[PDB]
Amino acid sequence: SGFRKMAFPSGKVEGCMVQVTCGTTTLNGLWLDDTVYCPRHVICTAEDMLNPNYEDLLIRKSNHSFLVQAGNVQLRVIGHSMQNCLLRLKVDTSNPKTPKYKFVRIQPGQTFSVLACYNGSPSGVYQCAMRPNHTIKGSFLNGSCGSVGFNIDYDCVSFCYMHHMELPTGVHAGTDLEGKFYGPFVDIQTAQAAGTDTTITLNVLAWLYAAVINGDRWFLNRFTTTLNDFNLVAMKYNYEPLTQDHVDILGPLSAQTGIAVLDMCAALKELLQNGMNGRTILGSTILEDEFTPFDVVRQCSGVTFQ
Ligand SMILES: O=C[C@H](Cc1cnc[nH]1)NC[C@H]1C[C@@H]2CCCC[C@H]2CN1C(=O)c1ccc(-c2ccccc2)cc1
Fold it and tell me: Is 111 helix (H, G, I), strand (E, B) or coil?
């Protein structure tokens, strides 16, 4: 029993973190095979960041303008190219700890684990969701750029995030591993701000199913709702509209608990209208939205408690 935010074991990623230095900037890169991936702003000073031109900044560097460290070993760069917002550096050695892996662009609402690194050295791990406004509520200090996000299935690591910047509200933005930002953000130190965010409805429902699988049913009710009357209520409380594809996604959880997804939407609609009356769900006093349906099935018993 119990339900916690849970990150994937981080060993396979820890064996890929390195340190990358260009001039006086140092940050983290990701060493798979014979490439090292890192934020392309490692080639910038503080002042360049106001208005950089990366193409023009990069033609000015050589292979030996980049220093790559892996533990105590110096790795020798033999090639470099820019890919959108990342650099790929080719190094003279193939990472012997490279895991089976793939690169994925995750979609708002999905979750992943982040290995926070400083100077190529892993310091912590936590789980977070991609918000609808394309930020994440990370925990990151200066020097954490190049820290990655990932999911693990079987033995295969799906890398899906690289950390590039922190926004004024204290949220974090970054890219996939082909260098394309998540959201409307760019690697320029120019006024930028998180767009308004929304509660991830699919996840709240998934988490209410969790609560039922463990054995708690206090927040259910006798009512059902149409999809459409749900949404009139959802918008008013700044929840994402529920779509039929989100309803189909919840099928398995609906089936494990015998609660119909709309019936759960009526449960939620009533939670939104009345509060929780000082009660809790899975230990929380507030509706939680950073567990996906897949996160609930992965963590919960396949046998409902009742
Ligand atoms: O390496 C980590 C940081 C990101 C981060 C820090 N804390 C959590 N995450 N890298 C931020 C870098 C690069 C980034 C690229 C996108 C546009 C914003 C920049 C911000 N970065 C700077 O180098 C930077 C640091 C400090 C200031 C600053 C300091 C004092 C007053 C105003 C600005 C401006 C830029």
Answer: strand
